[PDB]
Design a protein around this nucleic acid. Structure first.
Length: 135
RNA sequence: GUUUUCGGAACUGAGGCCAUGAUUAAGAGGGACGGCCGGGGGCAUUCGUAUUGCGCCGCUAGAGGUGAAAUUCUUGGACCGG
């Protein structure tokens, strides 16, 4: 819990992987390599109902938690990496995607580079669901 | 008896002559040739993320899924990140 960098000199960076599906939200702050994580709180560990694990509010107080946890450990700036469910499944981020990084911005954390890292397949396997779709 | 001119039948050589004999080249067709063209076909080769699984590392208690849930996965470490 000791960041040897001087604060007013410059900023200590981290990176949070925002994974917003349509059934849950993930806020995963890791180091610049990603091999070593700092905090990871989901939207489902903040609300006592499955149906709103991905609600934008459930991600708003899941990002205020990780930002509070990412503060004293010594990180001030964050690179953002949005990610939808990807693969052959959906490509647009879920509802709790925007209310997440807006919360941690309002929580006093600096922002670096923002990027979509959705796992876009070159040419997918057969997507789940019949030929006639989800009728 | 015979040979022929004699009329007929057949063959065989040299001619002479013909205005000496081949319509056109289909906004029909075939074929050739020319430079191209094309997710045409075949065989071989190469690349791409993704998905699933496994190994290791990190941190963790939920993760999945739905109209809402449950079956299912999970401190024997799932999901998430490398």
């Amino acid at each position: 819990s000791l960041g040897p960098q001087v604060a007013e000199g410059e900023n200590v960076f981290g990176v949070c992987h925002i994974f917003a599906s349509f059934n849950d939200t993930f806020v995963h702050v890791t180091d610049l390599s990603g091999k070593e994580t700092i905090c990871r709180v989901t939207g489902g560990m903040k609300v006592k109902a499955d149906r709103d694990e991905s609600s934008p509010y459930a991600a708003m107080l899941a990002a205020q938690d990780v930002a509070q946890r990412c503060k004293e450990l010594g990180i001030t700036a964050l690179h953002i990496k949005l990610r939808a469910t990807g693969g052959n499944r959906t490509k647009t981020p879920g509802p709790g995607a925007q209310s997440a990084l807006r919360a941690l911005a309002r929580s006093g954390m600096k922002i670096g580079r923002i990027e979509d890292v959705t796992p876009i397949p070159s040419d997918s396997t057969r997507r789940k669901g019949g030929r006639r779709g989800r009728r």
